[PDB]
Write a protein that binds this DNA or RNA. Structure first.
Ligand SMILES: [Mg+2]
Ligand code: NA
Ligand code: NA
Length: 328
DNA sequence: CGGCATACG
DNA sequence: CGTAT
DNA sequence: GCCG
């Protein structure tokens, strides 16, 4: 009744088990902070199963036969159903380790490994990091400077304004080039913490060298507060107008040749768990190797040509899911 | 028990 | 090491 | 942590 892979089932953005899924996702996050990628995956998958259910779980027996619910995830749900709270989840929430690792890893430029090292050095607050700035990368300095703005959600109205300024720069850099909104906003989210755009051109090869030309033009317009600088992905901080002022916003720009555009669109539309599950399914169930550039048959040694996302789902034997149902 | 997605900067 | 879905 |  419930398939084992997230790419085999629709997952809407809003659902009927929000509290249960949130709790499991705390444990997934905490597992990641400790480097337990396997446990993170299981808790992520179990949470996603609940998002895909058609009604609320009210009794423990409703978990029977659901994939990725074993002793541990079932106990979490059982405690939430019985008491409205799971002691393990609450212990994680208030732990100094969890709170500090969450604070540090949310900094642009800081991953689990860096945050863990700082935690082991005794560091706990953003101001702790500010007081020792020689130990920071330029990327981390920017993440810390802009951390407050970057913690504030971006609205869809903001996204539309950003897309227009990106299109202007892209049109000068390469007439005919197109800009597509991807990521969480393409899946229907009304807010987000970053904006994702995918850029291509209908004439194969014309997109070569495009991203530097786009970045130089955005920078000349005074819109780039931070970027790394040939390349095809740019992780930027943009200056976004606001009433009488402005705010910093994370924007990612990606270029792909049109032959690869369906694969890049699929990959950059997510969710992250949906894409991991889709690539796992492709390799393990179909023997095909999927990434954001293409889909490879290692037996024939050939790449599948796709003209659409629909093509890719068909080539994997999966029912098509629109972006709004990929919220795994 | 092995496996857990797969890239680019 | 960081970044992304 | 869970699946096959
Ligand atoms: Mg995003
Ligand atoms: Na980070
Ligand atoms: Na992004």
């Amino acid at each position: 009744w419930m398939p084992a892979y997230a790419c085999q089932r629709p997952t809407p953005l809003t659902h009927h088990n929000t509290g249960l899924s949130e709790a499991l996702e705390i444990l997934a996050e905490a597992a990641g902070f400790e480097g337990s990628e396997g446990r993170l995956l299981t808790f992520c998958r179990a949470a996603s199963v609940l998002k895909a259910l058609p009604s609320p779980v009210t009794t423990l027996s409703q978990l029977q036969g659901l994939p990725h619910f074993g002793e541990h995830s079932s106990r979490v749900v059982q405690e939430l159903l019985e008491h409205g709270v799971c002691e393990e989840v609450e212990r994680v929430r208030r732990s100094e380790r969890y709170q500090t690792m969450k604070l540090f890893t949310q900094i642009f430029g800081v991953g689990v490994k860096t945050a863990d090292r700082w935690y082991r050095e005794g560091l706990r607050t953003l101001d702790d990091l500010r007081e020792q700035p020689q130990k920071l990368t330029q990327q981390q300095k920017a993440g810390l400077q802009h951390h407050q703005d970057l913690s504030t959600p971006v609205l869809r109205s903001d996204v539309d304004a950003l897309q227009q300024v990106v299109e202007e720069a892209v049109g000068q850099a390469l007439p005919g080039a197109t800009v597509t909104l991807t990521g969480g906003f393409r899946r229907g989210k009304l807010q987000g913490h970053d904006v994702d755009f995918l850029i291509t051109h209908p004439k194969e090869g014309q997109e070569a060298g495009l991203l530097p030309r786009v970045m130089c033009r955005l920078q000349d317009q005074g819109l780039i507060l931070y970027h790394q600088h040939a390349f095809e992905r740019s992780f930027c901080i943009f200056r976004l107008p606001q009433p009488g002022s402005w705010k910093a916003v994370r924007v990612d720009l990606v270029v792909a040749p049109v032959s690869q555009f369906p694969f890049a669109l699929l990959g950059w539309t997510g969710s992250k768990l949906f894409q991991r599950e889709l690539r796992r399914f492709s390799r393990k169930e179909k023997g095909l190797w999927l990434n954001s550039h293409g889909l490879f048959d290692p037996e024939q040694k050939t790449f599948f040509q796709a003209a659409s996302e629909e093509d890719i789902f068909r080539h994997l034997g999966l029912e098509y899911l629109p972006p709004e149902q990929r919220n795994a």
